[PDB]
Amino acid sequence: KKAAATNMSWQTYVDDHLMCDVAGNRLTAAAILGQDGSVWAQSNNFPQVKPEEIQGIKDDFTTPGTLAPTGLFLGGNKYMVIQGEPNAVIRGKKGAGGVTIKKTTQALVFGIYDEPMTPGQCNLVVENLGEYLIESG
């Protein structure tokens, strides 16, 4: 019955809650884009995402398996699609690194890790914060 749904600043969500130091290491880069493709907040070194890349990501959330055969692209870098959560989470691999994308009510959470950060740690900070944004909208 209690909405009570507040909203911190977008950059503080990325600066404090996405690049937060986890077990000594942090994400390589992170960003939060609205589902329209607009960049609402991004890290200092997050790559510029092409709309054709954004268009495909929405297409695999609505239809899992779209980006899997061809691969997932972010700013010219190719990420191999790995086990993700249908319609909610897309996960990728690029060598010792990878990427986790969490779908929200109206936005998209991006998180990019490299060595030595583990894929589960990137999945941790992305899905949980995205799950919190799911709870609030």
Curated annotation (Swiss-Prot):
Lineage top rank: taxon: Eukaryota
Listed GO biological process terms: defense response
An example Gene Ontology CC term for this record: cell cortex
Gene disruption: observed consequences: Slight elongation of leaf petioles. Increased length of primary roots in seedlings.
Keyword line: Actin-binding, Cytoplasm, Cytoskeleton, Plant defense
Induction: Induced by hydrogen sulfide. Down-regulated by treatment with the flagellin peptide flg22 elicitor.
Keyword Cytoplasm annotated: yes
Places the protein is found: Cytoplasm, Cytoskeleton
Expression (tissue specificity): Expressed in roots, rosette leaves, cauline leaves, stems and flowers.
Chief location category: cytoplasm
MF GO annotations: actin monomer binding
Known partners and oligomeric status: Occurs in many kinds of cells as a complex with monomeric actin in a 1:1 ratio. Binding to the poly-proline motif of formins induces formation of oligomers through the N-terminal hydrophobic residues of PRF3.
Purpose of the protein: Binds to actin monomers and regulates the organization of the actin cytoskeleton. Can increase the critical concentration (Cc) of actin assembly in vitro. Acts as a downstream effector of the hydrogen sulfide signaling to regulate the assembly and depolymerization of F-actin. At high concentrations, profilin prevents the polymerization of actin, whereas it enhances it at low concentrations. Binding to the poly-proline motif of formin induces oligomerization of PRF3.
Further remark: Plants overexpressing PRF3 exhibit a dwarf phenotype with delayed seed germination, reduced lengths of roots and hypocotyls, and inhibition of hypocotyl cell elongation due to F-actin rearrangement.
Family note: Belongs to the profilin family.
Name of the protein in its database record: Profilin-3
Higher taxonomy: Eukaryota, Viridiplantae, Streptophyta, Embryophyta, Tracheophyta
Residues of the full protein shown: 38 to 167 of 168
